[PDB]
Amino acid sequence: VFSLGFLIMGTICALMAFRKKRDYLLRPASMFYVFAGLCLFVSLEVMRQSVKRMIEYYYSWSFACACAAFVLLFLGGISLLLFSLPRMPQNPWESCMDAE
Amino acid sequence: QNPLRKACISIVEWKPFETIILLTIFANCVALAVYLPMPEDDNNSLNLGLEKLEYFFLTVFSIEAAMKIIAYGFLFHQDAYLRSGWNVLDFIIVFLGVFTAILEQVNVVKALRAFRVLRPLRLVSGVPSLQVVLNSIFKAMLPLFHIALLVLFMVIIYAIIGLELFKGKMHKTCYYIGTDIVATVENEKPSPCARTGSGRPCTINGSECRGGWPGPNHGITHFDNFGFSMLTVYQCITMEGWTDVLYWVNDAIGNEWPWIYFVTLILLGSFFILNLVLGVLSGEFTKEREKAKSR
Amino acid sequence: MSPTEAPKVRVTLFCILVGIVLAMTAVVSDHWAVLSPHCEAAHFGLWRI
Amino acid sequence: FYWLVILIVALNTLSIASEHHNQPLWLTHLQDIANRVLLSLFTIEMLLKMYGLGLRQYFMSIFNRFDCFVVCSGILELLLVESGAMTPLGISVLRCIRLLRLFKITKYWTSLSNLVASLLNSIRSIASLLLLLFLFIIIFALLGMQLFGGRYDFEDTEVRRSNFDNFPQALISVFQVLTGEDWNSVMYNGIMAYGGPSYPGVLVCIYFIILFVCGNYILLNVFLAIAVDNLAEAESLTSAVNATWFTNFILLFILLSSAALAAEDPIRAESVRNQILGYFDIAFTSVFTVEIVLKMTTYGYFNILDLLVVAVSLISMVVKILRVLRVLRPLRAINRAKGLKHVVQCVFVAIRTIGNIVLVTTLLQFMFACIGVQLFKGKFFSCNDLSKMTEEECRGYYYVYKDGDPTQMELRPRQWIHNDFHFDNVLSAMMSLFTVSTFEGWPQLLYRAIDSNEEDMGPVYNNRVEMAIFFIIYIILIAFFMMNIFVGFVIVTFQEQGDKNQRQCVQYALKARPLRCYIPKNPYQYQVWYVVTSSYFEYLMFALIMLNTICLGMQHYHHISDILNVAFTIIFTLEMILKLLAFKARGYFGDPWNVFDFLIVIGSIIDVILSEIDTFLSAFFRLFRVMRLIKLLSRAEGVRTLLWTFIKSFQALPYVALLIVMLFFIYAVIGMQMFGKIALVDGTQINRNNNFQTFPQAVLLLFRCATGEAWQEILLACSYGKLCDPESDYAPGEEYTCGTNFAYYYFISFYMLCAFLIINLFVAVIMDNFDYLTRDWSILGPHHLDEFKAIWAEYDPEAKGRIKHLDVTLLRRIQPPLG
Amino acid sequence: VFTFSVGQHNYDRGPIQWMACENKGYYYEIPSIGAIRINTQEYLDVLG
Ligand SMILES: CCCCCCCCCCCCCCCCCC(=O)OC[C@H](COP(=O)([O-])OCC[N+](C)(C)C)OC(=O)CCCCCCCCCCCCCCCCC
Numbered sequence A: 001v002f003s004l005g006f007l008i009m010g011t012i013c014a015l016m017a018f019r020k021k022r023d024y025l026l027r028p029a030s031m032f033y034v035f036a037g038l039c040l041f042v043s044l045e046v047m048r049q050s051v052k053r054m055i056e057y058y059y060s061w062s063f064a065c066a067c068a069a070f071v072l073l074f075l076g077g078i079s080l081l082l083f084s085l086p087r088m089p090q091n092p093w094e095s096c097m098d099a100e
Numbered sequence B: 001q002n003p004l005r006k007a008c009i010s011i012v013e014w015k016p017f018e019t020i021i022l023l024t025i026f027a028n029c030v031a032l033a034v035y036l037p038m039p040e041d042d043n044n045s046l047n048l049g050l051e052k053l054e055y056f057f058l059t060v061f062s063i064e065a066a067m068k069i070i071a072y073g074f075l076f077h078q079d080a081y082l083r084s085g086w087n088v089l090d091f092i093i094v095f096l097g098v099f100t101a102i103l104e105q106v107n108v109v110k111a112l113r114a115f116r117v118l119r120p121l122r123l124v125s126g127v128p129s130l131q132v133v134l135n136s137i138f139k140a141m142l143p144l145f146h147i148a149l150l151v152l153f154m155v156i157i158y159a160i161i162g163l164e165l166f167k168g169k170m171h172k173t174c175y176y177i178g179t180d181i182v183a184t185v186e187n188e189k190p191s192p193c194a195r196t197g198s199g200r201p202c203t204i205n206g207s208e209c210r211g212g213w214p215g216p217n218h219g220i221t222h223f224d225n226f227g228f229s230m231l232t233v234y235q236c237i238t239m240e241g242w243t244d245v246l247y248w249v250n251d252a253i254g255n256e257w258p259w260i261y262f263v264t265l266i267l268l269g270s271f272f273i274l275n276l277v278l279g280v281l282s283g284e285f286t287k288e289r290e291k292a293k294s295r
Numbered sequence C: 001m002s003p004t005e006a007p008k009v010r011v012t013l014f015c016i017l018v019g020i021v022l023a024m025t026a027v028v029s030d031h032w033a034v035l036s037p038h039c040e041a042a043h044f045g046l047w048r049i
Numbered sequence D: 001f002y003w004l005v006i007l008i009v010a011l012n013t014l015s016i017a018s019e020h021h022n023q024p025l026w027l028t029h030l031q032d033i034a035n036r037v038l039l040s041l042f043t044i045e046m047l048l049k050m051y052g053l054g055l056r057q058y059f060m061s062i063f064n065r066f067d068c069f070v071v072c073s074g075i076l077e078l079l080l081v082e083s084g085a086m087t088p089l090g091i092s093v094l095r096c097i098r099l100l101r102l103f104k105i106t107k108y109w110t111s112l113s114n115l116v117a118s119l120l121n122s123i124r125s126i127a128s129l130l131l132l133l134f135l136f137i138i139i140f141a142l143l144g145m146q147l148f149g150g151r152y153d154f155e156d157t158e159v160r161r162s163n164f165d166n167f168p169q170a171l172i173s174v175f176q177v178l179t180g181e182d183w184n185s186v187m188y189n190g191i192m193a194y195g196g197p198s199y200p201g202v203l204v205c206i207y208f209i210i211l212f213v214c215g216n217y218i219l220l221n222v223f224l225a226i227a228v229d230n231l232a233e234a235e236s237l238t239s240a241v242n243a244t245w246f247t248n249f250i251l252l253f254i255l256l257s258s259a260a261l262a263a264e265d266p267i268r269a270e271s272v273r274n275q276i277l278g279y280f281d282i283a284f285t286s287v288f289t290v291e292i293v294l295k296m297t298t299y300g301y302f303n304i305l306d307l308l309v310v311a312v313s314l315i316s317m318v319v320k321i322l323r324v325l326r327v328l329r330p331l332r333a334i335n336r337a338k339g340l341k342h343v344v345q346c347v348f349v350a351i352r353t354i355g356n357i358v359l360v361t362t363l364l365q366f367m368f369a370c371i372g373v374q375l376f377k378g379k380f381f382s383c384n385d386l387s388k389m390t391e392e393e394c395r396g397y398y399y400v401y402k403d404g405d406p407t408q409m410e411l412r413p414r415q416w417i418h419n420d421f422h423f424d425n426v427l428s429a430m431m432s433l434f435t436v437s438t439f440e441g442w443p444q445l446l447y448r449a450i451d452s453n454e455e456d457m458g459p460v461y462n463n464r465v466e467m468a469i470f471f472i473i474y475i476i477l478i479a480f481f482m483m484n485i486f487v488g489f490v491i492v493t494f495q496e497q498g499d500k501n502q503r504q505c506v507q508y509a510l511k512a513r514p515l516r517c518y519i520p521k522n523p524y525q526y527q528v529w530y531v532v533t534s535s536y537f538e539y540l541m542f543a544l545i546m547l548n549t550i551c552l553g554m555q556h557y558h559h560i561s562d563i564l565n566v567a568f569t570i571i572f573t574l575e576m577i578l579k580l581l582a583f584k585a586r587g588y589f590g591d592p593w594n595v596f597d598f599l600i601v602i603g604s605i606i607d608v609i610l611s612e613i614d615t616f617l618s619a620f621f622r623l624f625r626v627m628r629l630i631k632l633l634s635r636a637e638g639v640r641t642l643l644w645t646f647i648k649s650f651q652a653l654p655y656v657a658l659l660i661v662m663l664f665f666i667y668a669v670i671g672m673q674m675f676g677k678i679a680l681v682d683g684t685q686i687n688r689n690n691n692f693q694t695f696p697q698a699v700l701l702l703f704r705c706a707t708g709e710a711w712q713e714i715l716l717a718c719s720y721g722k723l724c725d726p727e728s729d730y731a732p733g734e735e736y737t738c739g740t741n742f743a744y745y746y747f748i749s750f751y752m753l754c755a756f757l758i759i760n761l762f763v764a765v766i767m768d769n770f771d772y773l774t775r776d777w778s779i780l781g782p783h784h785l786d787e788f789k790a791i792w793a794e795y796d797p798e799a800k801g802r803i804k805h806l807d808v809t810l811l812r813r814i815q816p817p818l819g
Numbered sequence E: 001v002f003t004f005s006v007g008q009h010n011y012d013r014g015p016i017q018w019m020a021c022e023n024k025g026y027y028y029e030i031p032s033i034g035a036i037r038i039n040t041q042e043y044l045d046v047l048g
């Protein structure tokens, strides 16, 4: 439930940022997606110990679904961040937190 | 300061007293090195002689101080002597010397004999060349400040991370059943264990995983509080036996996650910081050379 | 538009959208665990089995 | 004569470098009469060239000043054995002088004589800064004789050879702790000598923390103020299909064939993963077998590389070399990767530079190998139990006592065991010296050499304590000196492909652009902005962070550790919302440090929520409260500068790190194939934690050997004697057949390469920033111009171009170096 | 006088051998636990 909540909150900022030249709003939303993934991950953790606290077993369809979803969200949020954050300066006159 | 009332000893101060004090300190060093430390308070004849030789080396270094403290001012008269850089170090040596050799003759402890190992430093005050060299390697570390301040906080951050994650985990091991003899094999150092977990389970025949074991290296390598976590992190940073800590954490809590902690501690802490230090020093050697070649 | 309507932002948000759809579909689906002490194969979910 | 003389010296070298242990008698004869003829041949050399180049020009030049000493000693040593020279140890050093005669002749070459005018002057000018380093070691030897001298009185039977019992031993121990090798074992002996891991006992960690930190720092001003001064002046004196749609996809199809090569199963010869990977095998062969035609029928060194890669992959649809020769799939990347060609070429032409100093170290290491054979040949045998001293006595069984208890014993067959890194022939001596040079397990060899008794006899505790010098001079030359002028070589060489100030200043002032500041209207929140950026508030939040850290450390093993986290989480989230009430959420995320704090406040919230949900009815979310103290870094402007200067340069030279990654990949796959069927037995070095079964385990093992963990014990853990894994497919009774002697080539090569690349990688990153390091902060620099930008943006909050004329007052907010 | 020099150390052993040889006795060395049995029963050769 918490992960879905983060997905909804991140989608809010993601939609309301393509318009009005509110570009900066890609910075919060991104991390929301990140956190989304993270929570799904710990769900896996929980599920893992569950399948061990009970015999043969098998992770078949939605465990790979969740693993992939978490990895997608995680890498995608970190990449959205590093694509929104301006740049590693790379020149003594270049500088973060600058004009345009 | 005062007139030439007592200062009838500064006459010799400029004689070849270089050799007479250099050789005296050199013989003091040699007499410090032939001493042979015996356990549990034994002794031998020779050691009992090299103490009857310490009042001969603690007299010369005291009269060659009372010969200079009355040949310059009341003590210094301008903050000269004790504010002279090195002559105060010699004075502190002759201060602790007689202080400790007198405090020992009062309760007729031995830890006070450990300030006796500074007397070799009066050799660096002896010659001037070593004075200017020891003043270079102290000036080459004015630039190494920020790197040390960046290492002191990486060690502090990794100590706290390991204190969060691996605190109190390496405390069970494979004992023999119903016994206090830890079970190992020929070349295996006693590593942690796990009963009903992800760590490694006991495979020696008659062995059980049980708690109440102090820790891996006789109780020294573990993240049980901040001091010990700092100690073990600093030991992994110097890249000595970091794989032992990794393998013990693996054997305790599981195989898949812990490497992130150590592989990253060795990349950042060791390789990156060493790179920084090499860069900052050569960038200071080449600068001083480009300035001193211009002479 | 340089950090908003350049290509790399759009492809990355497509990645995000696939992640979102996989996440919204991997929650209510009871498709990731089984058990049989051993023909009684149980099947897990997130709420009920 | 310039080549007959070297034929002579080569015959003498080969006569000295064939003395092994238990040589045939005819080899002894061949040697004892092959030096005699060359001694009688070097006798006339100081009589003929005393006649051709005059007579008095034999002494005014340093070169041939000793060739008379060669024979003066030769004759002297030729008539001493047959008079009184007993003590084969003393006779063994008589043959050492012989080695010296070979050295003078070998040295001739311009490259091998131009450097002693620099190397010898390096040592001889800086032999005073060596004195302070020797005095450091002499003070710490005495301090160790005080603290731990005679306190190793442990009532067990474990041998602790590195103690502080007398002066030579304390000197050895302090030296070993300086080189870093196993200093932790010495520390544990020191901590157990005192109480234990209790309060007063652990405080003797300090002796080993100051001796290793302050002692390895004088070794940076000693052996590396030589190769920055006395190697820079030496060279200064010598001065006097063409689309992005297909090629950029076929490149991407090498990164898939390679990852399919990685995740294989070396144990089970036929698995589902191997059955599944066998289809990607044919796919990734076929594509490149049908992509050579498009690139060679349309066209006329690098593509033959690809064709060989695909040929070996086709003949694989003994034969086992076919699967090792296919691992050079990641090397056709240099074919299409243009960005990586220019770094591999610098690596190729960085080698013409090191052939003059890399050949002087191998000859220096070959000189020491023959001395080592003269000293320690045959002396490194032993018995299981140290009471029997010859091979005729070391037969039968004997008792060992577990825990050192005379009532708990076990029978063991006793055997005459030879050491693993011995000194019998010069190849074995060279291997041993190699492992000593990398500092690994050198005290084990030292003590095996201090106890060396006689030619076929076992060790005698503390017999020859002066044999330490052999190991301590070697280490001082090779590992500490040549390994430092070689790095100085690389550094001053990169100094050439890498005035100034006016240039950089005029480029700064021309390219730079002023800043944003997000200053608000609407005084209601201007009030809150006035405090947010007050020094009071900033210098309060740092205090709160320090107190949070101190609360985080106070915890220990065996609640308050949670409520205080709730409190600090609240205090920080309130500062975040209180700053959003000021920067309008638009000027807030404009600052990266603010995004980073916003990333931590959420993590802390989730942390506390997960804790309380667990208690109401994720062990890694706890790292968010810890990372809070990393944002102490927005203020340490010096440290942040120093971090950015190097991150910008690691983000600029990634193609060199790609070399290291490819090296690890190739070697991990090769090793996964070669020694991957060995059994995981505990008590060895191929065990559950360090093995070659899977790909991550192999890469972790390689990373362990790069750091210089006991890589020679891993080397010995796989060499044709090794019990095979049970799940492997192998003939019955063919158990002790896993492992290969290829190991000796595998590890020795890897180490060298990986020691090379890393050094390369260090100096690039260093030289890339050589402006920042070699900089004066007193005359000028980009910091002054950055401060000018600061005072500008103070008056022009938003950029919006440039500002009005007067408010010309700023010359009062300007430092004198600028105005 | 039978003198036994026990352990593995560096202290001088001249005087102890002299004590053993000057007094019609014998001199034994015990470096480990394995040497104990054979070196503590071997004085019955001197006594005989
Ligand atoms: C001032 C300058 C800056 C200097 C410092 C800069 C670097 C900061 C330090 C980063 C720390 C590295 C992360 C910690 C590694 C975690 C170890 C671990 O999880 O094992 C023990 C624990 C083992 O505990 P456990 O709970 O599994 O054990 C019991 C078993 N169960 C779970 C069944 C109960 O691992 C975990 O708790 C599971 C979570 C692991 C996942 C963590 C990976 C991501 C962590 C952050 C990502 C950042 C990558 C590294 C840093 C990047 C910097 C380049």
Ligand SMILES: CCCCCCCCCCCCCCCCCC(=O)OC[C@H](COP(=O)(O)OCCN)OC(=O)CCCCCCCCCCCCCCCCC
Binding pocket: B145, B148, B149, B152, B156, B225, B226, B227, B228, B230, D546, D549, D550, D553, D554, D555, D556
């Ligand atoms: C240029 C740089 C030079 C500066 C010099 C720096 C050198 C110093 C580095 C060495 C620091 C190592 C400190 C080692 C001691 C740590 C405290 C300790 O040992 O105690 C652990 C204690 C265990 O408690 P326990 O004994 O189990 O309790 C039962 C009692 N019957 O449990 C505790 O209570 C420990 C609690 C202490 C936690 C403190 C955490 C420190 C973090 C502060 C970060 C800021 C650092 C300072 C800022 C400086 C800014 C410039």
Ligand SMILES: CCCCCCCCCCCCCCCCCC(=O)OC[C@H](COP(=O)(O)OCCN)OC(=O)CCCCCCCCCCCCCCCCC
Binding pocket: B255, B256, B259, B263, B267, B268, B271, B272, D660, D661, D662, D664, D665, D694, D695, D696, D697, D699, D700, D703
């Ligand atoms: C800064 C200047 C200096 C820079 C120096 C440059 C050096 C860079 C190279 C560093 C190499 C570090 C490699 C460390 C990663 C090793 C992974 C590992 O050790 O995990 C072990 C664990 C074992 O799992 P398993 O195989 O299942 O064993 C149990 C029974 N199944 O495995 C697991 O269970 C979890 C699996 C997760 C592992 C993911 C990554 C595996 C591949 C390694 C990544 C590296 C890229 C591969 C090749 C290049 C490596 C450099």
Ligand SMILES: CCCCCCCCCCCCCCCCCC(=O)OC[C@H](COP(=O)(O)OCCN)OC(=O)CCCCCCCCCCCCCCCCC
Binding pocket: B147, B148, B151, B152, B155, B225, B227, B228, B230, B231, B234, D197, D198, D199, D200, D202, D205, D206, D209, D210, D213, D214
């Ligand atoms: C040139 C100088 C070089 C700088 C290095 C010198 C730094 C000085 C170190 C300061 C240490 C002071 C310790 C403060 C007293 C601690 C009180 C104590 O008794 O704690 C012991 C602690 C565990 O507590 P314990 O008492 O054993 O609990 C069980 C029941 N008592 O067990 C302990 O181990 C406490 C001590 C921990 C030691 C920490 C070691 C790591 C820190 C050093 C790494 C810093 C590297 C700097 C690199 C800079 C680069 C140039």
Ligand SMILES: COC(=O)C1=C(C)NC(C)=C([N+](=O)[O-])[C@@H]1c1ccccc1C(F)(F)F
Binding pocket: D357, D358, D361, D362, D365, D433, D434, D437, D438, D478, D479, D482, D483, D484, D486, D751, D752, D753, D755, D756
């Ligand atoms: C690269 O690194 C490596 O590997 C090494 C090691 C450590 N070891 C040895 C022995 C050697 N060798 O022999 O050669 C090497 C060296 C050392 C020093 C200096 C120089 C050098 C060179 F390489 F260049 F050669």
Ligand SMILES: [Ca+2]
Binding pocket: B240, B241, D180, D181, D182, D439, D440, D441, D708, D709, D710
């Ligand atoms: Ca090591």
